[PDB]
């Protein structure tokens, strides 16, 4: 159970905290998992998706083994666009099609100065919590 | 009237500025709702008071 | 639109209901000290006759015995993996396993007022000093602890 009586177990509010939200904490409701050799490496499991991260789809018509690549993150609509994940519209000219990022998996991280800062903080609270209770 | 106050002229000027139809890129957006406008005023039917 | 057009009347569109509801209804009741007392001895003796406990569905056909008792080393278990292994020893896991099945969606408005997933009652456990026993069971559905 949630015990703390300043948190709600209420449908209607929860969806109104979700569907009237901001353009900043929408970076980590749209986060997505690392692959099976970036769980083994950094000590980081999920992560916020970004601009030039590489990715597989895993669910829908468009799944399978192709490491494509993200072109844009359309926060206002809870969905990313990916390189060759696209389709042909009624005048010939192809569109993009969007994928929510539960249904995706990262395959190359954009590694900046400030991105490595979320990677090496999350390899402390996983490792104090593991060490303190073992 | 042709003669007027500075004040009343200013009043009738706010209203023209208003009464003219929507620009339709306002219903090309994301989540939008507005079909057209029904606040549009026409001088033979309704009257402004004043 | 609204004009010359029905106003107060349990018949009217808009317009009051018949005998509006009041907070100062009698929401509670009381009982004697010795009928809330009379009715525990009754709920205790019928949870023994073992032909009664079956008819509350429970999954007892393999339970060693009785009204079941245990050494005082169950009061201090904080782990559920100890308390699950423990529930399989005494041969009553099958009642939890009836509880895992029993989980489902409900019928009705119930839903839109957040009483959504419903499910069965299981075994329930009675103890003298909570030394950790609440932590070890409290995640396994269907279990009440009870001092």
């Amino acid at each position: 159970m949630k015990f703390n009586p300043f948190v709600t177990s209420d449908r209607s509010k929860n969806r109104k905290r979700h569907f009237n939200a901001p353009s900043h904490i929408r970076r980590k409701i749209m986060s997505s998992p690392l692959s099976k050799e970036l769980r083994q490496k950094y000590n980081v499991r999920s992560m916020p998706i970004r601009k030039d991260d590489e990715v597989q789809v895993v669910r829908g018509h468009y799944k399978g083994q192709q490491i494509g690549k993200v072109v844009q993150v359309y926060r206002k609509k809870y969905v990313i666009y990916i390189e060759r994940v696209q389709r042909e519209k009624a005048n010939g000219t192809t569109v993009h099609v969007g994928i929510h990022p539960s249904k995706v998996v990262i395959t190359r991280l954009k590694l900046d100065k400030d991105r490595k800062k979320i990677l090496e903080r999350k390899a402390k609270s996983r490792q104090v919590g593991k060490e303190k209770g073992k | 009237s042709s003669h007027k106050t500075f004040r009343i002229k200013r009043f009738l000027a706010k209203k023209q500025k208003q009464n003219r139809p929507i620009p339709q890129w306002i219903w090309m957006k994301t989540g939008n709702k507005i079909r057209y406008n029904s606040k549009r005023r026409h001088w033979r039917r309704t009257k402004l008071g004043l | 639109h609204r004009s010359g057009q029905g106003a107060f009347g349990n018949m009217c569109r808009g317009g009051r209901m018949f005998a509006p509801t009041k907070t100062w209804r009698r929401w509670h009741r009381r009982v004697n000290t010795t009928q809330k007392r009379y009715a525990i001895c009754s709920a205790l003796a019928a949870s023994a006759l073992p032909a009664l406990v079956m008819s509350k569905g429970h999954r007892i056909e393999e339970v060693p015995e009785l009204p079941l008792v245990v050494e005082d080393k169950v009061e201090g278990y904080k782990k559920t993996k100890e308390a699950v292994l423990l529930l399989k020893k005494l041969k009553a896991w099958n009642d939890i396993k009836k509880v895992y099945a029993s989980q489902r969606m409900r019928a009705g408005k119930g839903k839109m007022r957040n009483r959504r997933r419903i499910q069965r009652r299981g075994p329930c456990v009675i103890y003298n000093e909570d030394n950790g026993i609440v932590k070890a069971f409290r995640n396994i559905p269907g279990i009440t602890l009870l001092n």
Binding site: - | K9, R10, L12, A13, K14, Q16, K17 | -
Partner: protein
């Protein structure tokens, strides 16, 4: 004012004025007609600023 306006057309394009008539439109802004001097020229200064 008229008096105010007449120095603002004077002290930014450099140019001396004859007279500055005004009125106020049904949309509600002030529109000043600015006569100019004979030694000065009107199509010529108009190019400098951009209105052609």
């Amino acid at each position: 004012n008229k008096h105010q306006i007449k120095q603002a057309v004077k002290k930014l394009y450099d140019i001396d004025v004859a007279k500055v008539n005004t009125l106020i439109r049904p949309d509600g802004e002030k529109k000043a007609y600015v006569r100019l001097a004979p030694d000065y020229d009107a199509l010529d200064v108009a190019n400098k600023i951009g209105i052609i």
